RNA sequence: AGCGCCGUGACGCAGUGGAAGCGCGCAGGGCUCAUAACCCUGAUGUCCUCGGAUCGAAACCGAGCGGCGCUACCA
RNA sequence: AGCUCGUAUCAGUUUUAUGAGGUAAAGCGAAUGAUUAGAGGUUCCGGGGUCGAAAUGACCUUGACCUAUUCUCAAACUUUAAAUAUGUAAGAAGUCCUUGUUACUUAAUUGAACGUGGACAUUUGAAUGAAGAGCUUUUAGUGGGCCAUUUUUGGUAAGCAG
RNA sequence: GAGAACAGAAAUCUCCAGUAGAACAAAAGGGUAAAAGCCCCCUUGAUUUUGAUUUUCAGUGUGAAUACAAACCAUGAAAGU
RNA sequence: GGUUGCGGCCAUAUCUACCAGAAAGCACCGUUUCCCGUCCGAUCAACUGUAGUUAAGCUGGUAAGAGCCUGACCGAGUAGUGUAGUGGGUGACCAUACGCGAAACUCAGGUGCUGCAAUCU
């Protein structure tokens, strides 16, 4: 049986970790909202080091969290730029995954000379239902190990879609 | 490997309380609500508990003792159909109606109902059940919403307005009933009365009827079967207010069967714990099968 | 020139000579420290009941 | 008892005193402040803070440190002069120059 | 220096308990308290308002006054050569009842029941308690119960 | 070059260990605690011989160290380095304080005496009782009188009246000989490098049968 | 015995929680037939060792290691 | 110096019942801190030695980490936890029944506090003893203390200091 | 722990475990997990009248704190605080 | 007896790994116009109860399970301790009399009970 333990996506998220604060961070935010259609959320520091040249609360980053048909469309577009070929070494221990890239305009973007070039960190959260059974206020619970997700079932579903293979290890 | 916690951790572990393990109460709020001014020694603190499932609402009048909480009244979307609502048993209006129902139930069972009648002609305004002169004061009750998000425009405050119109002295403020314009701190009684008699639901019915007939068939299917529309719903809500004020006296079911028959089927079909001798049989079977070297 | 700094020696003998007398308990104790709401209502109630009993047996 | 010999800092004048080691002697609450330096008007030195451009301040200490600083200002390059504020008679005491973060 | 403060030498005393940290249960609040009630005092360190002093930790007293979230308690206290009445405005998280008093009241109403039965029949109650009196004779048999003769065991080191 | 053990013998004062309060001690001279063929096994060395105490005193790391050397010297000289396993069984955590005065004639003028009595550390020590074992060894009956001679020498190095005892036990186990042997012709044991793992009657049958198979295949 | 100070490039001496200064010394080029001097340039500091607090210290607080200083009187 | 009363509105005590403690002792395959020694593993895994061009390829050794084990400890660690000491109750100022007061409280003659009227005696609410029980006034001297058992701090120790 | 370009042991993001091993101005000890911690919103009950009580204790004072009364307020849907 | 809501005691109730779940109730789930809030209708607000599934949550059972709780004619009257002795011992310490009496360990058992209201073959 497989009534509704069939797999799907929970969310896509897009992160950009700018080296410092400033016009660079504003431009990264502009890129993310131009793609997403929705305003982004900045990200502050945690502590201090000079090797990167940073301090506490210095506005290092930005990200966005998106869902649904738009998310999976962006995902499969990421896959076709990524030539439908990936790594079990890249793949995580849960079935969730992602990849960090350069040349963001490849996703079908009307480039502007101001923004320059920025690399990104895409991440993908797949699941089955019970998402709110863990993330609500009432009757909270930790899901069953059957309903949990894993490397093997997630990659098998992801491979039989597109018939797109990955590497051995 | 990772699926094995430590003996010392699991030993020194302190559980929470039961309802907190089940994710159902906030003892902060429960303490603040049931705890009582100790100059008023045995006189209780009457909560109006409200809770929200999918496909039902619960509203109860509750007090607190040492063995367990104790109930006076109740109200249920799944017994509203006596008084004349068939569909939309989780909406703002049914919540209001349940509040009205539990109010009339309390004042009926305590004889406080002839005086402090409440409100029948409704317009959607803020007013509390101010006491009579030289007579008994109205019933003082405090809302308990458990874990539910206090937010402007909720069926919980709808139920609250139902109680306050039904004749319960609940203290509150008009700054969370829908129509409460944020910047201009005044309530809108016409929008509130519209939500009473079904404004937003009728808007949804109207839009589905003008554009999306396939969804108009998928849902409101009972309204198609019963031939309901955007004036009938107001009329039935009004007549249902009248029926609630008429006969709130809780005729319950007949149960179709008996207690020990329900229990007979459940106990028959039930499981049971594997006793000491058959535990010995289990370990002995493992021995004779596997430690007997196949 | 140092000295004996402290000791509780012989203090309990001194006490238990004529010592650890219980406080005298009284009917109708002090109503100081008691809640004035209760004091006020209690005052008016006792005034009323004194009047009432004298009128019942005048 | 302690003999003390100390230099007046805003003036440069020696001060020797003596008093028992256990008796109380007063101390002020000296502070250095590291102020940056801009274009010098008439004799008043001109120092700004990170959150304020105020302080038509401590008036150009005439010492050999001061003259070298006067010469140093002619060739520029961010000049952070340090001062002190003991008992409200402010004066410049030392200095540092930038090399990065242009 | 010598340090003698309101919460000095109190570590293990206002230690909450093992596996009972966090909040408080509800019978502490739903119970009732009136003037003349005898009550115990143990302090709940999780409620840092309304506390008693460590002298009054683990003690017993009588009520004289009752307010919103608090209760008056009288205690007698040795100070030199007298017992002083000391009045405390404590919280019910730190209060609890005295089961000695509870069992005493139960014995009282049962004594009244015995006096009622002796009003019904006149049969010489002998109400007062009496200690464990010395016991009376009896005859122990021997059938299936012969006496086993015992004697000591020699000393073996057992290491 | 130390002050005498007669000055630091009895348990006159409470346990003063190393902690976050002292933080600064002079380390021991003993550093080895197990000697001989420690990687021997349980049935390999059956005899276990002890050194226990009938006093109640403190024993210094210096005495432990010298006694270790004397006993190990005797055994490794006469019966060889791999005919025994020696194990000390008391660790010195206690610490010993000294109010360091002067060693001159004319110290009167700057000594200051008992003002400032709290002394600084200058060593360590153990704390033992009745029956608390000091040394133990595991070897064979051929090596018996040899090893008890070694423990005899260690007695001669330690203060107080200490006794030697041949236990009723098989090695450093808490088990006695015939019960160990019935267990070993049975199958509840599985030797480690030094100690042994047992079969529980509690817990995972699957792990026991993953282990200890022959006892089930009796 | 008791108390206090100090440890910064090869050397001497400054150094203030946002992050190392000067002089000498050293190296390279040019003048000189060659070195010196001279003119144009550049570099080098676990800031005794360990731990701690701090978002982060050479600095701030313990441990140790080293070099010193001050006490040492009335008998 | 007395004063008000006359066997009790008491007790350096026991018993019954109920509380509170975290010291002795105990534990460290239980948390924190310290500590001894092995084995068995994981090397995308620290240092490497080898097979080889190298390969998350293969082997061997050696420090980590993980697994279960073992030995020793804690005045300023602890799950546990005494003995001795310690609070309170053992009724008449009490218990029950009925209804009076009130501006307090309750949805409410509901509840609280203090009362009216009535009932509950010889065992009127465990033991033992009570040499009278309670209460005030005024004033002397004293405010250098030492010794013993048991517990204990500093110190090697002391007819030492505490 | 398992991943995600630059990005490594340490930059930012996501999932799982996480009884507190963090944080609560500081010394140390208690206390706290839909909070007393972190963020957000609104405020000035850090207000007035004075009494009672605890601790040190002579049952004196100072300091600190506790629980009420009469007012006026804040915050919250409200109990409440 | 099962389920839901409000609970009392707050692990016999927890944790891990599976197995099962008649009916009913819960739940998963479907939708964004309305009040409302988010980077995002994921949380929360609102609408239907229709499309569907008992897979997850939830409930119960298994585990010579870890953990927790109880009992022992298990250790052990041991360790410790009150009172007495012109008791022993060089001393540390120990024995005796009248008394109280542990913890670790070993073994045996157990794995939530129950109140108010509504509901279910």
UniProtKB/Swiss-Prot annotation, chain A:
State the superkingdom.
Answer: Eukaryota
Q: Does the keyword Ribosomal protein apply?
A: yes
**PTM text:** N-terminally acetylated by acetyltransferase NatA.
What GO molecular function annotation could you give as one example from this UniProt entry? rRNA binding
Any single GO CC term annotated in Swiss-Prot or TrEMBL for this entry: nucleus
Tell me where it resides: Cytoplasm; Nucleus
- Please give the InterPro entries that the UniProt record associates with this protein: Ribosomal_uL5, Ribosomal_uL5_C, Ribosomal_uL5_CS, Ribosomal_uL5_dom_sf, Ribosomal_uL5_N
What coarse category fits the chief subcellular location reported for this protein? Answer: cytoplasm
Recite the UniProt keywords alphabetically.
Answer: Acetylation, Cytoplasm, Methylation, Nucleus, Ribonucleoprotein, Ribosomal protein, RNA-binding, rRNA-binding
Task: Give the GO terms filed under biological process for this record.
Answer: cytoplasmic translation; ribosomal large subunit assembly; translation
* Residue numbers carrying N6,N6,N6-trimethyllysine: 70
What protein family is recorded?
Belongs to the universal ribosomal protein uL5 family.
Tell me the subunit arrangement.
Component of the large ribosomal subunit (LSU). Mature yeast ribosomes consist of a small (40S) and a large (60S) subunit. The 40S small subunit contains 1 molecule of ribosomal RNA (18S rRNA) and 33 different proteins (encoded by 57 genes). The large 60S subunit contains 3 rRNA molecules (25S, 5.8S and 5S rRNA) and 46 different proteins (encoded by 81 genes). Component of a hexameric 5S RNP precursor complex, composed of 5S RNA, RRS1, RPF2, RPL5, RPL11A/RPL11B and SYO1; this complex acts as a precursor for ribosome assembly.
Q: What else is known?
A: Present with 21200 molecules/cell in log phase SD medium. There are 2 genes for uL5 in yeast.
The name this protein goes by in its record: Large ribosomal subunit protein uL5B
Source species taxonomy: Eukaryota, Fungi, Dikarya, Ascomycota, Saccharomycotina
Gene for this protein? RPL11B
Curated annotation (Swiss-Prot), chain B:
**UniProt-listed InterPro entries:** Rbsml_uL18_euk, Ribosomal_uL18_C_euk
Q: Where in the cell is it found?
A: Cytoplasm; Nucleus
Q: Domain of life here?
A: Eukaryota
Q: Which UniProt keywords apply?
A: Cytoplasm, Isopeptide bond, Nucleus, Phosphoprotein, Ribonucleoprotein, Ribosomal protein, RNA-binding, rRNA-binding, Ubl conjugation
Q: What GO MF annotations does this protein's record show?
A: 5S rRNA binding; structural constituent of ribosome
- What processes does the entry annotate via GO biological process terms? cytoplasmic translation; ribosomal large subunit assembly
Which positions does the record annotate as the modified residue Phosphoserine? Answer: 164, 173, 232
Main location per UniProt?
cytoplasm
Quick check: keyword Nucleus in the entry? Answer: yes
A single Gene Ontology CC annotation of this entry is:
nucleus
Q: Where is this cross-link: Glycyl lysine isopeptide (Lys-Gly) (interchain with G-Cter in ubiquitin)?
A: 161
How would you summarize the oligomeric state and partners of this protein?
Component of the large ribosomal subunit (LSU). Mature yeast ribosomes consist of a small (40S) and a large (60S) subunit. The 40S small subunit contains 1 molecule of ribosomal RNA (18S rRNA) and 33 different proteins (encoded by 57 genes). The large 60S subunit contains 3 rRNA molecules (25S, 5.8S and 5S rRNA) and 46 different proteins (encoded by 81 genes). Component of a hexameric 5S RNP precursor complex, composed of 5S RNA, RRS1, RPF2, RPL5, RPL11A/RPL11B and SYO1; this complex acts as a precursor for ribosome assembly.
Query: Into which family does the record put it?
Result: Belongs to the universal ribosomal protein uL18 family.
The name this protein carries in UniProt is: Large ribosomal subunit protein uL18
What species was this sequence derived from? Saccharomyces cerevisiae (strain ATCC 204508 / S288c) (Baker's yeast)
UniProtKB/Swiss-Prot annotation, chain C:
- Give a yes or no for keyword Ubl conjugation in this entry: yes
The UniProt annotation puts the region (Disordered) at 1-36
Q: Where along the chain is composition biased (Basic residues)?
A: 1-25
Keyword flag Cytoplasm: yes
Pfam families, from UniProt?
Answer: Ribosomal_L29e
GO CC, alphabetical? cytoplasm; cytosol; cytosolic large ribosomal subunit
- Crosslink (Glycyl lysine isopeptide (Lys-Gly) (interchain with G-Cter in ubiquitin)) position: 51
What UniProt keywords apply to this chain's record, in alphabetical order?
Answer: Cytoplasm, Isopeptide bond, Ribonucleoprotein, Ribosomal protein, Ubl conjugation
Query: Where is it located?
Result: Cytoplasm
Choose any GO biological process term that the UniProt entry carries and state it. Answer: cytoplasmic translation
Recorded hits in Gene3D superfamilies, A to Z, give: 6.10.140.1730
Q: What are the cysteine partners in each disulfide bond? A: none
One GO MF term attached to the UniProt entry: structural constituent of ribosome
* Entry function: Component of the ribosome, a large ribonucleoprotein complex responsible for the synthesis of proteins in the cell. The small ribosomal subunit (SSU) binds messenger RNAs (mRNAs) and translates the encoded message by selecting cognate aminoacyl-transfer RNA (tRNA) molecules. The large subunit (LSU) contains the ribosomal catalytic site termed the peptidyl transferase center (PTC), which catalyzes the formation of peptide bonds, thereby polymerizing the amino acids delivered by tRNAs into a polypeptide chain.
Miscellaneous section: Present with 51100 molecules/cell in log phase SD medium.
Identify the PANTHER family for this entry: 60S RIBOSOMAL PROTEIN L29
Q: Which family does it belong to?
A: Belongs to the eukaryotic ribosomal protein eL29 family.
- Protein name stated in the entry: Large ribosomal subunit protein eL29
Q: Which gene encodes it?
A: RPL29
UniProtKB/Swiss-Prot annotation, chain E:
What interactions and quaternary structure are annotated? Component of the large ribosomal subunit (LSU). Mature yeast ribosomes consist of a small (40S) and a large (60S) subunit. The 40S small subunit contains 1 molecule of ribosomal RNA (18S rRNA) and 33 different proteins (encoded by 57 genes). The large 60S subunit contains 3 rRNA molecules (25S, 5.8S and 5S rRNA) and 46 different proteins (encoded by 81 genes).
The Swiss-Prot or TrEMBL record describes its family as follows: Belongs to the eukaryotic ribosomal protein eL21 family.
- Tell me one Pfam family matched here: Ribosomal_L21e
Q: Where is this cross-link: Glycyl lysine isopeptide (Lys-Gly) (interchain with G-Cter in ubiquitin)?
A: 31
UniProt-listed PANTHER family: 60S RIBOSOMAL PROTEIN L21 (PTHR20981)
This entry carries the following GO cellular component terms, namely: cytosol; cytosolic large ribosomal subunit
Q: Where in the cell is it found?
A: Cytoplasm
Q: What else is known?
A: There are 2 genes for eL21 in yeast.
GO BP field: cytoplasmic translation
Primary role: Component of the ribosome, a large ribonucleoprotein complex responsible for the synthesis of proteins in the cell. The small ribosomal subunit (SSU) binds messenger RNAs (mRNAs) and translates the encoded message by selecting cognate aminoacyl-transfer RNA (tRNA) molecules. The large subunit (LSU) contains the ribosomal catalytic site termed the peptidyl transferase center (PTC), which catalyzes the formation of peptide bonds, thereby polymerizing the amino acids delivered by tRNAs into a polypeptide chain.
**One Gene Ontology term of the molecular function aspect:** structural constituent of ribosome
Q: Which keywords accompany this UniProt record?
A: Cytoplasm, Isopeptide bond, Ribonucleoprotein, Ribosomal protein, Ubl conjugation
Q: What protein name does the entry list?
A: Large ribosomal subunit protein eL21A
């Amino acid at each position: 049986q497989n009534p509704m333990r069939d797999l799907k996506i929970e969310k896509l998220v897009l992160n950009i970790s700018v080296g410092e604060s400033g016009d660079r961070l504003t431009r990264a935010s502009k890129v993310l909202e131009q793609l997403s259609g929705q305003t982004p959320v900045q990200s502050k520091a945690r502590y201090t080091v000079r090797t990167f040249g940073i301090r506490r609360n210095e506005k290092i980053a930005v990200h966005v969290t998106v869902r649904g048909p738009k998310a999976e469309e962006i995902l499969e577009r990421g896959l076709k730029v990524k030539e439908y070929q990936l790594r079990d070494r890249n793949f995580s221990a849960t079935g969730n995954f992602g990849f960090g890239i350069d040349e963001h305009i490849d996703l079908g973007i009307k480039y502007d000379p101001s923004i320059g070039i920025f690399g990104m960190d895409f991440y993908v959260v797949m699941n089955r239902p019970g998402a709110r059974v863990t993330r609500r206020k009432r009757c909270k619970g930790t899901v069953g190990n059957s309903h949990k997700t894993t490397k093997e079932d997630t990659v098998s579903w992801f491979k039989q879609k597109y018939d797109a293979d990955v590497l051995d290890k | 490997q990772k699926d094995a916690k430590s003996s010392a951790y699991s030993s020194r572990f302190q559980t929470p309380f039961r309802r907190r393990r089940e994710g159902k109460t906030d003892y902060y709020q429960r303490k603040r609500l049931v705890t009582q001014h100790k100059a008023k020694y045995n006189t209780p603190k009457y909560r109006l508990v409200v809770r929200f499932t999918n496909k039902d609402i619960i509203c109860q009048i509750i007090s607190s003792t040492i063995t367990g909480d104790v109930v006076l009244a109740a109200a249920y979307s799944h017994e509203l159909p006596r008084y004349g609502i068939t569909h939309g048993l989780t909406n703002w209006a049914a919540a209001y109606a349940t509040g009205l129902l539990i109010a009339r139930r309390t004042l009926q069972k305590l004889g406080l109902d002839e005086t402090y009648k409440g409100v029948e002609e409704v317009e959607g305004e803020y007013e509390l059940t101010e006491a009579v002169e030289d007579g008994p004061r109205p019933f003082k009750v405090f809302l308990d919403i458990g874990l539910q998000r206090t937010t402007t425009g909720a069926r919980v405050f709808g139920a609250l307005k139902g109680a306050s119109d039904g004749g319960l002295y609940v203290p509150h403020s008009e700054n969370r009933f829908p129509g409460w314009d944020f910047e201009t701190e005044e309530i809108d009684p016409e929008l509130l009365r519209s939500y009473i008699f079904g404004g937003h639901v009728s808007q949804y019915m109207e839009e589905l009827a003008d554009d999306d007939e396939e969804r108009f068939s998928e849902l409101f299917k009972g309204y198609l079967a019963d031939d309901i529309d955007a004036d009938s719903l107001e009329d039935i809500y009004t007549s249902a207010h009248e029926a609630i004020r008429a006969d709130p006296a809780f005729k319950p079911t007949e149960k179709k069967f008996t207690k020990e028959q329900y229990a007979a089927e459940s106990k028959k079909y039930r499981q049971t714990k594997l006793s000491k001798e058959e535990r010995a049989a289990r370990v002995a079977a493992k021995i004779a099968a596997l430690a007997g070297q196949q | 020139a140092k000295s004996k700094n402290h000791t509780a020696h012989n203090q309990t003998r001194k006490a238990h000579r004529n010592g650890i007398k219980k406080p005298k308990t009284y009917k109708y104790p002090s109503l100081k420290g008691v809640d004035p709401k209760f004091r006020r209502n209690h005052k008016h109630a006792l005034h009323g009941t004194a009047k009432a009993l004298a009128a019942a047996k005048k | 008892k302690v003999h003390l010999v100390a230099i007046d800092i805003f003036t440069g004048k020696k001060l020797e005193d003596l008093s028992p080691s256990t008796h109380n002697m007063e101390v002020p609450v000296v502070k250095r402040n590291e102020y940056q330096l801009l274009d010098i008007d008439d004799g008043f030195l001109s120092l700004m803070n990170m959150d304020g451009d105020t302080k038509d301040d401590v008036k150009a200490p005439e010492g050999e440190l001061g003259d070298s600083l006067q010469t140093a200002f002619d060739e520029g390059k961010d000049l952070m002069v340090t001062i002190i504020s003991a008992m409200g008679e402010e004066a410049a005491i030392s200095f540092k120059e930038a090399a990065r973060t242009d | 220096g010598k340090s003698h403060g309101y919460r000095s030498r109190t570590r293990y005393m206002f230690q909450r308990d093992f596996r009972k940290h966090g909040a408080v249960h509800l019978s502490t609040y739903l119970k009732v308290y009136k003037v003349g009630d005898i009550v115990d005092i143990k302090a709940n360190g999780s409620i840092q308002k309304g506390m008693p002093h460590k002298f009054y930790q683990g003690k017993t007293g009588v009520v004289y006054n009752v307010t919103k979230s608090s209760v008056g308690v009288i205690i007698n206290k040795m100070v030199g050569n007298r017992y002083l009445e000391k009045r405390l405005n404590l919280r019910v998280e730190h209060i609890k009842h005295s089961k000695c008093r509870q069992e005493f009241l139960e014995r009282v109403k049962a004594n009244a029941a015995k006096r009622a039965e002796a009003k019904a029949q006149g049969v010489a109650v002998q109400l007062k308690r009496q200690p464990a009196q010395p016991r009376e004779s009896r005859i122990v048999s021997t059938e299936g119960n012969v006496p086993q003769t015992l004697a000591p065991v020699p000393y073996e080191t057992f290491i | 070059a130390r002050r005498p053990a007669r000055c630091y013998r009895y348990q006159k004062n409470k346990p003063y260990p190393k902690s976050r309060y002292n933080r600064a001690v002079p380390d021991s001279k003993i550093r080895i605690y197990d000697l001989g063929k420690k990687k021997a096994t349980v049935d390999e060395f059956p005899l276990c011989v002890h050194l226990v105490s009938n006093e109640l005193e403190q024993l210094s790391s210096e005495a432990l160290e010298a006694a270790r050397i004397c006993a190990n010297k005797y055994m490794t000289t006469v019966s060889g380095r791999d005919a025994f396993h020696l194990r000390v069984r008391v660790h010195p955590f206690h610490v010993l304080r000294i109010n360091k005065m002067l060693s001159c004639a004319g110290a009167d003028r700057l000594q200051q005496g008992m003002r400032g009595a709290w002394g600084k550390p200058h060593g360590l020590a153990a704390r033992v009782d009745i029956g608390q074992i000091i040394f133990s060894v595991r070897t064979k009956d051929s090596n018996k009188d040899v090893v008890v001679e070694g423990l005899r020498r260690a007695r001669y190095k330690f203060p107080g009246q200490q006794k030697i005892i041949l236990s009723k036990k098989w090695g450093f186990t808490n088990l006695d000989r015939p019960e160990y042997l019935k267990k070993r012709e049975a199958g509840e044991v599985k030797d480690d490098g030094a100690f042994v793992k047992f079969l529980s009657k509690k817990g995972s049958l699957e792990n026991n049968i993953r282990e200890f198979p022959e006892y089930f295949a009796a």
